[PDB]
């Protein structure tokens, strides 16, 4: 399973931003990564936001799971 998780980061990193393979990241898949937010993080050209801001968005929702048991707070219903 080690060659399974190692081929997740390697494949993802090349595809997400940058690597005949180095200039493939020069156009970048940042145009593919762009459409998720709205438009506004446009500065990803050489300081690439959507390359980095996906890992940090993954590390937040991964740490939302551990905190969920402690801060329950929910009634016998749903919120607004």
């Amino acid at each position: 399973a080690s060659v399974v998780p190692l081929k997740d980061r390697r494949l993802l990193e090349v595809k997400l931003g940058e690597l005949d393979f180095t200039p493939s990241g020069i156009a970048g898949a940042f145009q593919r990564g762009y459409y998720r937010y709205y438009n506004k993080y446009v500065n990803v050209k050489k300081g690439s936001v959507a390359g980095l801001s996906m890992v940090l968005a993954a590390y937040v929702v991964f740490n939302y799971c551990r905190s969920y048991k402690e801060l329950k707070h929910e009634r016998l219903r749903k919120y607004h």
Binding site: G17, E18, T22, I26, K45, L56, Y59, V60, S67
Partner: protein
Amino acid sequence: NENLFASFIAPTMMGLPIVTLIIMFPSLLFPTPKRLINNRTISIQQWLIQLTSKQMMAIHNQKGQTWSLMLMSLIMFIGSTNILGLLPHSFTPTTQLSMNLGMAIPLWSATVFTGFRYKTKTSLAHFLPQGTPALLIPMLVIIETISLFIQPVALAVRLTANITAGHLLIHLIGGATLALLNINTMTAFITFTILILLTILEFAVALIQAYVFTLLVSLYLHD
């Protein structure tokens, strides 16, 4: 009696979940390329080192420059692990006081044993400052040695105590927004206080200059 603030009483929890994943994670944010031209996201990491490798190099100018290639690894770790934690529900390893007492003492005592393996006399004959007057020899060498052993405690406790102090004002000013179901005008001003305070809490980069540098001065002075 117009604007009544509220408060909420709730325990503020520095729990201890599984740490050895969380330590390794700000290593994989930085890649390293085996190529000549790089790919415009390492290239602004590679430039950022070039700068601050030219300020912990300039002072020393010795054959103690061999030590300085490590000191730029020390600045990227607590430069990152203090900047990751500003996110919504993340966890900083430099919050707990445990590892910082393992970052000070194996580094601080690596300095006093550096001159004692080469100089052996004049490293702690730096306790002799000047052309000795008579009435203040015992008042001096009980002072300048009590301000030596303070230095490992002075180096670690200054880091843990203000990093966590940033996190409580994040919660308490933030938690007073949630419990502000009274008059709704003052809710924005507490929110606007937060988004100023989060700009001040990017002095978590500024507090790593004051950890590598007073390690250099505590290296340059001894050696």
